[PDB]
Design a protein around this ligand. Structure first.
Ligand SMILES: [Mg+2]
Lengths: 111, 468, 52
DNA sequence: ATCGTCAGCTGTGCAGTA
RNA sequence: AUACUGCACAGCUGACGAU
């Protein structure tokens, strides 16, 4: 039951810092379009590009984009970075999911 | 694509080098590996008079013989070949008069409508322990004592009306000379009904009249004779080994953690040694895993036991654990093994909470013994369809195990998997073949399940006949 | 080579989008009568869901 | 002071004997 | 607690971010 993945090429990194989890929550209520594929680590955005034409410039703020290929990101043998990478993959799985809903709070399901 | 293997069904060794892979048929054909030197085994029964009469009728009924259950599956339901000239154990069971106690109705009434859920269990366990103590101090001591619990007694110590009755019973009965065995009044007659715990609409379910005996008499023979019925078949040209099992348990109140160990190793002649320990190593933290000095102590005690028995040191110190090996645990284990002077060693984490599964097409699941090498880890199936039984004895997709070594073992995967698949059928508490866990984990769990209730400053024994 | 593992399961609602108070025992009742042939089909169905 | 992610470990009860 | 398998639920441990 295993399934391979193929990751995209470019990764976009920002340096916004004045945005805790509560701030990004209260800005994703009033965000307009819903993409929901970002994470918060403190001082980093750590998302899969789309930093301007996604109604997310309220947190991007046209920051200094650090264009780095994802091939070096998966090789980063660190547990703390691996958990955040798995978080980003999980949140990107939450895209293409509003058409099939699911994932209430606890069962980690996709009904 | 990964590389897969299919392991054969392991064979046991009964008396007179009989081979075979089924405990029931091998016991019916050649008998136990260690034959009893006597002819009769004395049994003592404790309970009210209805339970004693039911137990006596039960043994006299099963002495003649019980036929099988079904005809479609002959091997899965073999008939019990009597208890007589054609007994599978080559011995007789005899309940001697005078080695039998009784409990009055008023005394059970005192343990009846009585408040609190700790006092009543205390009175029941101390009355039973005192009765067994008075029996043991006389001249009619049996070899194994059967506790036949009445239906009424279940409603105050087990159902509804909170410690474990069995745990305190075994803990208080640890200081005796004979082991005990507990039945539940529905194994001895098929006319009674015991309700469930939370919902009273349903009731308990019992296996079969022929299925009860094949386990009960085997366990009774092991407990009352002390001789092992069967054992695993050794190969030719393998190194001398010694298996250790580690587990953790929490106490009744406080949710701190402890550590239990099991100390299997083989014997010089035709035997098998399986025993616990004689100490408990503190309560250092409520986390899982273990410290370094405790690992040093465990390894030292295991090597001391092997040196005491074989007058030498083993060549393999195979270690199994239910949790991931931290750095300090491995450091202590390696330091103890290097100071002792042993060259071969394996440390394996056995994991049950994995999600990868093997799917085939058809109405039946994968065969018992399929192994898949997942890039260093190992997926092993110890349950599923078997050709000997002629079906799959389950109700859902079986649950595989994940084996992972801690990067310093001296042997490759698909050999540790073979040894673990060999070590699963040795269990003298059941006669089935669909057991999943190997014995070094189950022994430690069963040891801890009774070691929970031993008070501070008491004595403990390494006997395995007082934990099952 | 990031890998995804899928494990089929069921979710019960009263009607539409609402939790059920008796949601625990239906899972056991559905899993008890299942065979070992529907799981593989559900897995390849999920793969076809994700691929398409 | 608890809230989010990631990997885990134990207890306490049923159904079903294929 | 004659037995094993399968399922369900409840707890509480570590690594990371701030209020
Ligand atoms: Mg037993």
């Amino acid at each position: 039951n295993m399934l391979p993945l193929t990751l995209p090429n470019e990764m976009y990194i920002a340096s916004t810092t004045y945005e805790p989890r509560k701030a990004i929550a209260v800005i994703l209520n009033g965000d307009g379009p819903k993409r929901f594929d970002w994470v918060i680590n403190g001082g980093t955005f750590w998302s899969f590009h789309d930093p301007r034409t996604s109604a997310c410039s309220e947190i991007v703020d046209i920051d200094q984009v650090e264009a780095i290929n994802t091939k070096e990101l998966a090789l980063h043998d660190d547990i703390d970075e691996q958990n955040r990478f798995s978080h980003l993959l999980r949140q990107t799985l939450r895209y293409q999911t509003d058409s099939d809903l699911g994932w209430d709070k606890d069962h980690k399901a996709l009904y | 694509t990964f590389e897969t293997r299919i392991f054969d069904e392991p064979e046991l060794e009964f008396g007179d080098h009989h081979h075979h892979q089924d405990p029931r048929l091998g016991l019916s054909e050649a008998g136990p590996l260690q034959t009893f030197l006597g002819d009769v085994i004395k049994i003592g029964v404790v309970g009210n008079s209805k339970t004693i009469e039911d137990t006596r009728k039960f043994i006299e009924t099963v002495s003649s013989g019980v036929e099988g259950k079904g005809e479609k599956h002959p091997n899965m339901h073999p008939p019990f070949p009597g208890l007589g000239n054609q007994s599978p154990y080559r011995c007789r069971f005899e309940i001697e008069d005078g080695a039998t106690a009784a409990l009055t109705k008023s005394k059970l009434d005192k343990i009846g409508k009585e408040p609190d859920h700790y006092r009543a269990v205390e009175m029941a366990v101390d009355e039973i322990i005192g009765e067994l103590q008075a029996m043991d101090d006389g001249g009619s001591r049996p070899d194994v004592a059967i506790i036949a619990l009445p239906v009424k007694l279940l409603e105050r110590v087990w159902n509804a009306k909170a410690p474990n009755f069995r745990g305190m019973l075994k803990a208080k009965a640890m200081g005796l000379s004979f082991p005990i065995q507990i039945v539940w009044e529905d194994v001895i007659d098929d006319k009674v009904t015991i309700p469930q715990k939370v919902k009273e609409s349903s009731s308990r379910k019992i296996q079969d009249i022929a299925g009860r005996t094949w386990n009960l008499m085997t366990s009774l023979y092991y407990k009352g004779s002390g001789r092992i019925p069967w054992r695993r078949m050794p190969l030719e040209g393998e190194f001398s080994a010694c298996y250790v099992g580690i587990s953790f348990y929490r106490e009744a109140d406080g949710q701190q953690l402890f550590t239990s160990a099991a100390q299997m190793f083989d014997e010089r002649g035709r035997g098998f040694v399986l025993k616990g320990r004689r100490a408990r190593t503190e309560s250092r933290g409520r986390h899982p895993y273990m410290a370094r000095e405790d690992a040093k102590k465990i390894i030292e005690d295991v090597l001391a036991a092997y040196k005491l028995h074989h007058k030498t040191l083993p060549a393999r110190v195979f270690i199994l654990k239910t949790s991931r090996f931290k750095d300090e645990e491995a450091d202590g284990i390696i330091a103890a093994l290097d100071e002792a002077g042993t060259e071969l060693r394996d440390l394996v984490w056995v994991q049950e909470s994995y999600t990868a599964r093997i799917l085939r097409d058809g109405n039946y699941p994968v065969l018992r013994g399929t192994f898949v090498d997942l890039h260093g880890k190992g997926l092993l199936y110890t349950s599923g369809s078997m050709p000997y039984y002629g079906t799959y004895p389950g109700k859902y997709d079986p649950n595989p195990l994940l084996l992972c070594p801690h990067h310093t073992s001296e042997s490759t995967v698909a050999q540790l998997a073979e040894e673990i698949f060999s070590l699963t059928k040795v269990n003298w508490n059941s006669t089935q073949m669909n057991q999943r866990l190997p014995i070094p984990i189950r022994a430690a769990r069963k040891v801890g399940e009774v070691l929970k209730y031993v008070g501070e400053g008491e004595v403990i024994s390494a006997d395995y006949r007082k934990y099952i | 080579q990031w890998y995804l593992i899928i494990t089929p399961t069921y979710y019960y609602t009263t009607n539409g989008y609402a939790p059920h108070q008796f949601a625990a025992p239906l899972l056991a009742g559905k899993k008890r009568l299942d065979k070992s042939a529907a799981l593989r089909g559900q897995v390849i169905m999920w793969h076809r869901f994700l691929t398409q």
